[PDB]
């Protein structure tokens, strides 16, 4: 039969459930997809990659760079096959090269779900598209681009661009209204300093995240993999989410993600601490100060949040010991302070 979606819901399924798409990145993450294929994905093959991971980083905090570091990378790229061709496999001993293998493996983590989603296939009675939308459990619904809506978050959008991100600017194409199913009755609505932020993602992640949700990393991680903690990561700054789109040159359609975050009590930071949880004693949510923030003179408020519109004034952080963030990002532990309210269908034009 004929399709009883929006057409724009139509091409919003089309691109996210795009499994050759989602392969493609894989490879471009040197991810082997034929010895392991993303249709042979199980949640027990990532869990022993997080494991992996995790005696990883026991090697590196104990500086044992040698022979137990090789033996544990190569249990790595055992459990998550890589395809180096003839190169060698490079050694894990940096935050950044940790972080890098945590990306993979959450994107496989995604992959999963959505080949498991477009797998299960009904027959002549519903469109496909539909059925995947179905599967959801996430209502997606197209905005109008001269609606009002369309006009706050487009000046939400380019207002807060940062200019250090100047590499490439963004073109709205498409706005939809986000409602996934459940997701309004957990939210904690007695918590204060509720405000519409951003969160960026690659493709591959997004039938993962809207059937889902965004989520808290799993026990056997790595704790150092995670900058704040595991937690779920936010920004005020457009550009700064749009970053973790990994959009390219030649894939320069993304989805920025904006929702609801009951922040409650900030406990505010300067550096970097993959411990700040346990910090917390009472607060709600991490706030990473940065440098250069949208000010309070310009917020405003969509559905009960504020949306921290505006040019972004300088704040007047420096952090004298260290490293000063560029911009902030928040940080909460229990999806509960997440309600996931707009998707945007993004082009980056670089
Ligand atoms: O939000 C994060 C996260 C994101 C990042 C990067 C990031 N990604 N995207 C952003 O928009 C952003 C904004 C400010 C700061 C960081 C970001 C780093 C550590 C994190 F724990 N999550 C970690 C991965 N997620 C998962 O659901 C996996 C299944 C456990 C989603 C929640």
Same mark, same amino acid.
């Given at each position: 039969?004929?399709?009883? $979606?929006?057409?724009?819901? #139509?091409? !919003?399924?089309? @691109?996210?459930?795009?499994?050759? *798409?989602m392969?493609?990145?894989?490879? =471009?993450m040197?991810?082997?997809?034929?010895?392991?294929?993303?249709?042979?994905?199980?949640?027990?093959?990532?869990?022993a990659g997080?494991?992996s991971?995790?005696?990883?980083?026991?090697?590196?905090?104990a500086?044992?760079?040698?022979?137990?570091?090789?033996?544990?990378?190569?249990?790595?790229?055992?459990?998550?096959?890589?395809?180096?061709?003839?190169?060698?496999?490079?050694?894990?001993?940096?935050?950044?090269? $940790?972080?890098?293998?945590? #990306?993979? !493996?959450?994107? @496989?983590?995604?992959?999963?779900? *959505?080949?498991?989603?477009?797998?299960? =296939?009904?027959?002549?009675?519903?469109?496909?598209?539909?059925?995947?939308?179905?599967?959801?459990?996430?209502?997606?619904?197209?905005?109008?681009?001269?609606?009002?809506?369309f006009?706050?978050?487009?000046?939400?959008?380019?207002?807060?661009?940062?200019?250090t991100?100047?590499?490439?600017?963004?073109?709205?194409?498409?706005?939809?209204?986000?409602?996934?199913?459940?997701?309004?009755?957990?939210?904690?609505?007695? $918590?204060?300093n509720?405000?519409?932020?951003?969160?960026?993602?690659?493709?591959?992640?997004?039938?993962?995240?809207?059937?889902?949700?965004?989520r808290?990393?799993?026990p056997?991680?790595?704790?150092?993999?995670?900058?704040?903690?595991?937690?779920?990561?936010?920004?005020?700054?457009?550009?700064?989410?749009?970053?973790?789109?990994?959009?390219?040159?030649?894939?320069?359609?993304?989805?920025?993600?904006?929702?609801?975050?009951?922040?409650?009590?900030?406990?505010?930071?300067l550096?970097?601490?993959?411990?700040?949880?346990?910090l917390?004693?009472?607060?709600?949510?991490?706030?990473?100060?940065?440098?250069?923030?949208?000010?309070?003179?310009?917020?405003?408020?969509?559905?009960?949040?504020?949306?921290?519109?505006g040019?972004?004034?300088?704040?007047?952080?420096?952090?004298?010991?260290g490293?000063?963030?560029?911009?902030?990002?928040?940080?909460?532990?229990?999806?509960?302070?997440?309600?996931?309210?707009?998707?945007?269908?993004?082009?980056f034009?670089?």
């Amino acid at each position: 039969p004929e399709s009883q $979606l929006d057409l724009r819901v #139509q091409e !919003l399924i089309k @691109l996210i459930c795009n499994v050759q *798409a989602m392969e493609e990145m894989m490879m =471009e993450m040197k991810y082997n997809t034929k010895k392991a294929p993303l249709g042979k994905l199980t949640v027990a093959q990532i869990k022993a990659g997080y494991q992996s991971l995790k005696k990883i980083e026991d090697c590196i905090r104990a500086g044992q760079h040698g022979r137990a570091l090789m033996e544990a990378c190569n249990e790595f790229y055992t459990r998550i096959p890589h395809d180096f061709g003839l190169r060698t496999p490079p050694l894990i001993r940096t935050q950044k090269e $940790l972080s890098e293998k945590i #990306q993979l !493996l959450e994107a @496989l983590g995604d992959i999963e779900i *959505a080949i498991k989603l477009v797998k299960s =296939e009904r027959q002549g009675l519903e469109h496909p598209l539909d059925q995947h939308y179905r599967n959801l459990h996430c209502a997606l619904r197209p905005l109008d681009h001269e609606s009002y809506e369309f006009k706050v978050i487009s000046q939400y959008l380019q207002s807060t661009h940062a200019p250090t991100h100047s590499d490439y600017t963004m073109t709205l194409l498409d706005l939809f209204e986000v409602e996934k199913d459940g997701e309004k009755e957990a939210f904690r609505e007695d $918590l204060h300093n509720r405000m519409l932020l951003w969160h960026g993602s690659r493709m591959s992640n997004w039938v993962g995240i809207l059937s889902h949700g965004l989520r808290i990393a799993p026990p056997e991680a790595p704790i150092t993999g995670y900058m704040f903690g595991k937690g779920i990561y936010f920004a005020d700054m457009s550009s700064k989410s749009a970053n973790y789109c990994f959009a390219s040159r030649l894939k320069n359609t993304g989805l920025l993600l904006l929702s609801e975050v009951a922040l409650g009590q900030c406990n505010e930071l300067l550096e970097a601490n993959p411990k700040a949880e346990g910090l917390l004693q009472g607060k709600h949510s991490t706030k990473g100060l940065g440098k250069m923030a949208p000010s309070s003179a310009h917020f405003v408020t969509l559905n009960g949040s504020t949306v921290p519109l505006g040019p972004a004034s300088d704040t007047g952080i420096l952090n004298p010991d260290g490293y000063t963030l560029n911009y902030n990002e928040y940080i909460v532990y229990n999806p509960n302070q997440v309600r996931m309210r707009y998707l945007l269908k993004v082009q980056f034009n670089f």
